[PDB]
């Protein structure tokens, strides 16, 4: 399984793969893995029915994104603080915030959860 995780991510550099494609295909591995993880652990599950196992890979995948969505803004604040002066030179933060927030906007785009760039301030 540690392989499938490395393989998906490696496709950002090679193939110049879309950021959306990489994140989407990784959640499958986990969902595919958790479903595959449990079939090995419990026997009452392995005999629950096929319509009951595919539904798992879905229920997980949805929660994953919804969690990621609710988790974005607090992350920018955290990211901001961990790097915001005086943690770093203000003369240096002049070069950091913008690009940090550039990439964090890039995410704001894809997940379509915009966050104002105010968190990044002075």
């Amino acid at each position, epitope marked *: 399984f540690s392989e499938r995780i490395g393989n998906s991510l490696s496709s950002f550099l090679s193939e110049s793969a879309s950021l*959306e494609v990489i994140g989407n295909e990784l959640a499958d591995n986990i969902a595919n893995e958790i479903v595959s993880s449990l079939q090995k652990d419990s026997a009452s599950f392995l005999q629950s029915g096929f319509d009951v196992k595919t539904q798992l890979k879905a229920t997980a995948k949805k929660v994953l*994104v919804e969690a990621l969505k609710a988790a974005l803004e607090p992350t920018e604040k955290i990211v901001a603080s961990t790097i915001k002066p005086p943690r770093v030179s203000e003369d240096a933060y002049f070069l950091l915030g913008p690009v940090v927030k550039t990439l964090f906007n890039k995410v704001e785009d894809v997940l*379509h959860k915009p966050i104002p760039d105010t968190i990044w301030e002075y």
Partner: antibody
Amino acid sequence: EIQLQQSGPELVKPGASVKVSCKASGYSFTDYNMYWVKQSHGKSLEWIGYIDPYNGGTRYNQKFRDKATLTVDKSSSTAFMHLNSLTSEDSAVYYCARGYYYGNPLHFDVWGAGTTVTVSS
Amino acid sequence: QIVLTQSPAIMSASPGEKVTMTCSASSSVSYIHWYQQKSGTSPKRWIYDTSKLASGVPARFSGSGSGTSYSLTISSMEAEDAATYYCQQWISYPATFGAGTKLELKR
């Protein structure tokens, strides 16, 4: 049922602003996003922007970055679109729609009645 | 930024004829969405996630596509199928639409 109501048509004098609204019902107003679209001639469809109700953050198309300004009010389960410096090119039908992102590129599952705005002295 | 060109601009079809409208793009897209609009009405969600049909859409509709040439097809034209159909994408910001493909009925 799940239905998006808007405001009626507005005759607005050129160079004025207008604040149209789009209310929601049936579903949870705050869980889905609200996007705003324009249709000139009844032919060409153009995206303007959208806004996250819970966070309140907006995202605009470059063409309408300062022309349009979006606001919301959870109390009324309503979203608004604010416009400035209205020209003839700004007279068209404006729709409001719902969405929620599940990884794949976003689409529009619900559409409003369309608000026809008329700019003319 | 992405220009979507739909052809034909207008299209006639007799009941039962195989209908196919295109949306040629300037770049590639993984997923796409198709919307139906009739006169005086708001657009309606028609085909989400490229090939998934929406709640309340006959099965004669099966839209597909690959890369830059995504197309909508109908096995058998019918009266209620007559409408304007637009292509939409949000792989890249900004989100863009096709010129529009009107669908008339043949009498």
